[PDB]
Amino acid sequence: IWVEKYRPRTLDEVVGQDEVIQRLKGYVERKNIPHLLFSGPPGTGKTATAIALARDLFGENWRDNFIEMNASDERGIDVVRHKIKEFARTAPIGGAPFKIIFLDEADALTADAQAALRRTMEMYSKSCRFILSCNYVSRIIEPIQSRCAVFRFKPVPKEAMKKRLLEICEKEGVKITEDGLEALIYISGGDFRKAINALQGAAAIGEVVDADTIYQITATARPEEMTELIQTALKGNFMEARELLDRLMVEYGMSGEDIVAQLFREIISMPIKDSLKVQLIDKLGEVDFRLTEGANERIQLDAYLAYLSTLAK
Template structure:
């Protein structure tokens, strides 16, 4: 079982294992299913069983079923999967990929060796992006690389997608293209927004927020996430930081529950402005 955030190489690792084990016959002895597309028990009863019950090809000792986003399967489907794993263990191996191993039922977890993947380091993201850019004849400016690392947050898939989209506009990748394509505000602009709010100037902070949301196309959740990332770089005392983090978490929860994002963001900025007086 591969457990970890998206874009860190879980699927690539599974494919690499299959290619190493089966060589030229890997496509015939390896199948990939995405549980988020078909969450019900039917995918276990039909697709998985049909592949599992056939013999390996090319002299291989077993075949591999890779079930991506296995944590999206319903409990009934996971129970059926457990029985299938036991029944076809002689000629089939299973690799499960999930974001949260806690969503996998215990009987399956106990039958798996769990490998936990973590977010990739910024240096690893940068190195791979440089490699892709070199192969594609692109040039990544230093500020463009910093922007790629910022928007990726350790997610290689997100970094490469942003690089690919930016390459449609210019062969030299700068930060403005990356932030515009990914609908992300410049970190400096978020820092400026926080400075204005923390100085107690609520009206100016609200105007700054307006310009960010309209010009950058940011959603309320995007703004909250970027504020969360930026607040730790601000000169804020311990107790005040705790209070601000509590409010950020509360607003994030309310937005998840469907609250009006404009009202919630204004309330968050007001809380920041009042923090100066406390």
């Protein structure tokens, strides 16, 4: 399960996030941690560095102290408070003052539960410390940002991930091609968890990791096929386009959201006029809405391939 076997071990090993880590290192020399707020897209390293941050400060004895828990399971903030009192009365065994709790998905709670943090902040900043992961900082009520040093994780980039992916491979006897690497990244959206997990799943199978084997495992169309489907649509061949999208949707087994996602990506990365690209995206915006309201997947989608085949003349 590659995405854990390559969980960074020191802050130095979390890549793409110099911005955050360069200054997050300046908290290990002094041994200070004010409640951390980690913001960013998923699969970029919030949990990783919050491990490698607890790992660089305790040495060998992190597992005993640090604990990760999902903050959106609404009845457990109050049931995991006895872990707050045993954990605050125990002094870091070795030669350190403070101790850490990680809280994934913080930005899912309404105003209320958020407060309960505070009566363990001013009472435990000489013992306890929180790291709060959230998708966006905007979504955490101010009275907490107030007591937090904030870190905005940016989506990692191509070469930095591509490198790390290779290292996960050479060290695990997996043979990716260049094709399957580049493809493993189209997939990833710049999200490691997604990327690693995929690779892992393609590694489990028989040997060579082709561009395809990656497209198959994640159920996301070859980008060549999309810009075929969109193209054969724009030309005027509706029934053909419908055929493709069908075949396509069964081959990998994508959702309507999933198809509309790729439709988007490949509508953007088309080399067509900014004048027309709008017309497409606008409608695509429309269609994506229709779906989320609960309208019929098949009909709205085919109805969008219809949209394109009017723009023939």
